Design a protein around this ligand. Structure first.
Ligand SMILES: *C(=O)C1=CNC(C(=O)O)=CS[C@@H]1c1cn(C)nn1
Length: 359
């Protein structure tokens, strides 16, 4: 392995990084040789002088969508839901003619026809929620245009769990977190755990995410670098997942539904074929692309996960910035949590280099 050389590669990547982007603290895990390697830097809480630790809770931001995808995926494999089914199958009060051709897959993979990045600030409840989607007008027709959005995968998450009869948070805990024994992963941090909760920093001001409609589904999950490492591992080598529906869930989430250039969308996760040059992934991480509606090319029928992939997901909040990546065929991976939202391509800049030192 070369643990000495390994603590060198990470320190020599992360310290300049943290200095350059003004990051108070970071928790890193590299998985290599079937093992997670934990490395910690700086401060969780600077006014309190609390050091970062492998049980420091960071807000994952958009990386919560990977959890939303496996859940949704587990419900599929359970038979409670199907991607081809019209959305209206699970929410018949969605009465617009607009909603006609949109299947569940569309919501799941951002291709309804233009659902917006975030959910409006006025949407504060289900009524307001329904008026929103009732009176939302497309732009493009179903299955024609990828536009990353919370209002899209958020609604999939919320609809996906209805047949379970469980609220979203209990379903997530029951069908996904506990089975994988992610016992320090929360949608809501218990009072008894807040001391492990890092502070975020935005403009030299400590901040923490605020509640919003559909948050848990699209950005509101919080972890430590240990549960996150085990999460990457369960998805990386799903072969030792007991529960047959969860392993299949992981599988549907890393299936390719849509080809968008060098990238292929899954449920929450995104993929590229390996090998992939650094800058194609790095520039692909730029918001110039990331948040831009691009056309799409159906993978029909959806291909099951290909080990030969760089699968990853970026995600942030006000004061937090994280990123995770893996290469199933290489059995190598990395987690980078930080309490400062710093440039996304900086993130993949670092993770790529660290990973290539292991090849
Ligand atoms: C997910 O990463 C996430 C990061 N901020 C963004 C974005 O598009 O990158 C808006 S969507 C999502 C988020 C974070 N918050 C607080 N709300 N949505």
């Amino acid at each position: 392995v070369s643990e000495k050389q390994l603590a060198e590669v990470v320190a020599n990547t992360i310290t300049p990084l943290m200095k350059a982007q003004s990051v108070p603290g970071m928790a890193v895990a590299v998985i290599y040789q079937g093992k997670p390697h934990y490395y910690t830097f700086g401060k969780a809480d600077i006014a309190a002088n609390k050091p970062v630790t492998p049980q420091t809770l960071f807000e994952l931001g958009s990386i919560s969508k990977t959890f939303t995808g496996v859940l949704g995926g587990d419900a599929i494999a359970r038979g409670e839901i199907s991607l081809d089914d019209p959305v209206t199958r699970y929410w018949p009060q969605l009465t617009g003619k607009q909603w006609q051709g949109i299947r569940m897959l569309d919501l799941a993979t951002y291709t309804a026809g233009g659902l917006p990045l975030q959910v409006p600030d006025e949407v504060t409840d289900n009524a307001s929620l329904v008026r929103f989607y009732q009176n939302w007008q497309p732009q493009w027709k179903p299955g024609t245009t990828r536009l990353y959005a919370n209002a899209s995968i958020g609604l999939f998450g919320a609809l996906a769990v209805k047949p379970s009869g469980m609220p979203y948070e209990q379903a997530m805990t029951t069908r996904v977190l506990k089975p994988l024994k992610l016992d320090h992963t929360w949608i809501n941090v218990p009072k008894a755990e807040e001391a492990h909760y890092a502070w975020g920093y935005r403009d030299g001001k400590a901040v923490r995410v605020s509640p919003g409609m559909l948050d848990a589904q699209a950005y509101g999950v919080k972890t430590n670098v240990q549960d996150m490492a085990n999460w990457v591992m369960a998805n990386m080598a799903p072969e030792n997942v007991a529960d047959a529906s969860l392993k299949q869930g992981i599988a549907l989430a890393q299936s390719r539904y849509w080809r968008i250039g060098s990238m292929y969308q899954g449920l929450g996760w995104e993929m590229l074929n390996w090998p992939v040059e650094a800058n194609t992934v790095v520039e692909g991480s730029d918001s110039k692309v990331a948040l831009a509606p691009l056309p799409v090319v159906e993978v029909n029928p959806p291909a099951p996960p290909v080990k030969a992939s760089w699968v990853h997901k970026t995600g942030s909040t006000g004061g937090f910035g994280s990123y995770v990546a893996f290469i199933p065929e290489k059995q190598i991976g990395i987690v980078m949590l930080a309490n400062t939202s710093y440039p996304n391509p900086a993130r993949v800049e670092a993770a790529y280099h660290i990973l290539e030192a292991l090849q």
